[PDB]
From a paper:
The structures show a zig-zag arrangement of nucleosomes, with nucleosomes 1 and 3 forming a stack. H1 binding to stacked nucleosomes depends on the NRL, whereas H1 always binds to the non-stacked nucleosomes 2 and 4. H1 contacts DNA with L1, the amino-terminal part of α2 together with L3, and α3 to stabilize the nucleosome and contribute to chromatin compaction.
In all structures, nucleosomes 1 and 3 form a canonical stack, whereas nucleosome 2 is located in a DNA loop between the two stacking nucleosomes and is rotated relative to the nucleosome stack. H1 is absent from the stacked nucleosomes of the 4×177 array, but is present on nucleosome 1 in the 4×187 and 4×197 arrays, and is present on both stacked nucleosomes in the 4×207 array. Thus, histone H1 is bound to non-stacked nucleosomes in all structures, whereas H1 binding to stacked nucleosomes is enabled only as the NRL increases.
Residue numbers in the entry:
A (entry chain b), G (entry chain f): 20 to 102
B (entry chain h), E (entry chain d): 30 to 124
C (entry chain g), F (entry chain c): 10 to 118
D (entry chain a), H (entry chain e): 37 to 133
The structure:
């Protein structure tokens, strides 16, 4: 029930696949851990917002509405999840 | 027993059939169409509301939304939306 | 004793619902009053935008020779139109991927 | 002698594949675990709708896609092809992060 | 005389005299403070109005504005603004 | 036998107007109904933000040996607090100029 | 009555001093005409909307309030002129 | 021999001056002429408040100043100190314009 080191769960080839979809030929080795950190900070932002939406809603389960709405506020609007 | 959840299914369905008699749609593309029309409606409605507040107008008319779609919709889409909305209010006032 | 109900969607000749757009405008709380021509104009703009993007989606799907449009087709439609890309610059389409855009130096030779 | 491609063309075949294809690029379970780990630090005992987890999945992949396009522009700006930490720092700082 | 143009002038002047007895203010700085209070009021009120719509709530209360502070205001600014919000509302309920 | 007209800002112990912010919530048309503690809280947040930024403005004025706040003091107070900078990243101060910052590459050795 | 060339009205020393406020130590020679065009495009985006504000209000006089609204709709909010 | 400063030194003093200074950097009436020229392209014979022209001038200076912040960042990104049109285009593209 304790979760300790899940930032390493976003594997290095997963980052390679992400950069391939973004259109990258070559990825340095220093890239993976800081993109883990950057994505970490990004989820800190959006999940902090969604947690505030959640505790405002007096529910205990984070929903897709809270996700898409938190992305919507930050100029990162997402389609396809009931918005 | 269930509760009704509103969507923009049938209208997008009739439009896609009218512009393409043979072409179908997936369910996820339908969800993205629902999200798109909701986003555009909220943008135009918010900008129309702000135009209403800025000249101290408590009413929203087609002039207000015409101003809004001139603000948001870039270039050629603006004049085409002006054309269709003008024709639409033309048939609405004539009937 | 009463006239037959005939919708303002049919009065304007637009398949988008004038009544539902008016209801969402009243309950979206944007002004105290809304003129009757405003939802008609808004629904006409909405139907034009949907018709244009669905036209591009159907054309792109026919280019992929597929009779049903998918979110990939929506991404291909949106990113290939400069005015639609201006309208949807910061908007993300789910499971649509990205437009194939490889920079020129990335190609060999 | 067994076949071996020169460096780069496997990368471009990947480019064409995952730009042509659409599917999710992060393994779903470790992403879900990372999200639960982060949300545990903010408010205790959170559960997640599965669709919310895939929503963070799509949004995170697209966010990284936008960043990696920006770092691609930064790298080709700097006469390079291999991106560096200062490229992501530039992209975030120009965008205002 | 003309129509009165509302401002936040004497209010910000009282705040300055409370925080800095000997420091003065210019008129352009006061216009920027009017722009500040109007902009922050606009941001908080707009996001809290959207929060009211999202939960299908007809009321915006101190809870919605508090949550809006947690979204918009960063970090220690957020939690301190929460602290003075709670002291203000407890003083008001105690009259 | 009507009571004395007391003010809600003084009732809450504030300087910013509870009444005017409440009226602007009613007239900014943001909800049909507004809770009573909401304008008090919003005025508290506004007064605290203005209190910190005027404190930093007076401190910057005392730093520049000026007894009066100039918009340059306001811009220096915004940009020297990184959290206030993140609050107001997209906002430009009139006649504030820009914060003095030179990249170390530009400076000579 | 008609005006043909005010792009050169934003002179090269004016662009120089703008970039000096911008922290730019050295400016290429090809910068000036491009920034004139870029400012022209930015003013297209601003002034077209500001005009649309004015005949939205049925006014002939362009006001500072319309300019403030047009800037803040682009997310480039200007303090000091509202009210 | 008359006194003579090395290049960039006067530029650096100009730097420290213009972040030290707060006044307008665009000439007022030529900017008024430019904004009237752009305005008459949309609606002829428009009239301007002087405060409106000053607000447009302040916003234009703000836009360009922030644009050259990003441009200077992109220039030092490419190990250069003199900005180029590709730096401006890069910053404008990454910003989302």
């Amino acid at each position: 029930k304790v979760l300790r080191d899940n930032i390493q769960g976003i594997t290095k080839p997963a980052i390679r696949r992400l950069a391939r979809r973004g259109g990258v030929k070559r990825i340095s080795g220093l890239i993976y851990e800081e993109t883990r950190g950057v994505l970490k900070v990004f989820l800190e932002n959006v999940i902090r917002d969604a947690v505030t939406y959640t505790e405002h809603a007096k529910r205990k389960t984070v929903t897709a509405m809270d996700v898409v709405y938190a992305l919507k506020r930050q100029g990162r609007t997402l389609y396809g999840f009931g918005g | 027993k269930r509760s009704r959840k509103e969507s923009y299914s049938v209208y997008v369905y009739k439009v896609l059939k009218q512009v393409h008699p043979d072409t179908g749609i997936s369910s996820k593309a339908m969800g993205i169409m629902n999200s798109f029309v909701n986003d555009i409606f909220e943008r135009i409605a918010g900008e129309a509301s702000r135009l209403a507040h800025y000249n101290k107008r408590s009413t929203i008319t087609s002039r207000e939304i015409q101003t809004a779609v001139r603000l948001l919709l870039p270039g050629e889409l603006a004049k085409h939306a002006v054309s269709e909305g003008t024709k639409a209010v033309t048939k609405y006032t004539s009937a | 004793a009463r006239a037959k109900a005939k919708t303002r969607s049919s009065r304007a000749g637009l398949q988008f619902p004038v009544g539902r757009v008016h209801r969402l405008l009243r309950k979206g709380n944007y002004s105290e009053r809304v003129g009757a021509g405003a939802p008609v104009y808004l629904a006409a703009v909405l139907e034009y935008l949907t018709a244009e993007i669905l036209e591009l989606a159907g054309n792109a799907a026919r280019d992929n020779k597929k009779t049903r449009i998918i979110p990939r087709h929506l991404q291909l439609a949106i990113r290939n139109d400069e005015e639609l890309n201006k309208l949807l610059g910061r908007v993300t389409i789910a499971q649509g991927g990205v437009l194939p855009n490889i920079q020129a130096v990335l190609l060999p030779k | 002698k067994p076949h071996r491609y020169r460096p780069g063309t496997v990368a471009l075949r990947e480019i064409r594949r995952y730009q042509k294809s659409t599917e999710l690029l992060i393994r779903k379970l470790p992403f879900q675990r990372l999200v639960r780990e982060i949300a545990q630090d903010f408010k205790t005992d959170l559960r997640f709708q599965s669709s919310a987890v895939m929503a963070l999945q799509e949004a995170s992949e697209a966010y990284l896609v936008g960043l990696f396009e920006d770092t691609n522009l930064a790298a080709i700006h700097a006469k390079r092809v291999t991106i560096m930490p200062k490229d992501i720092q530039l992209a975030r700082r120009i965008r205002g992060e």
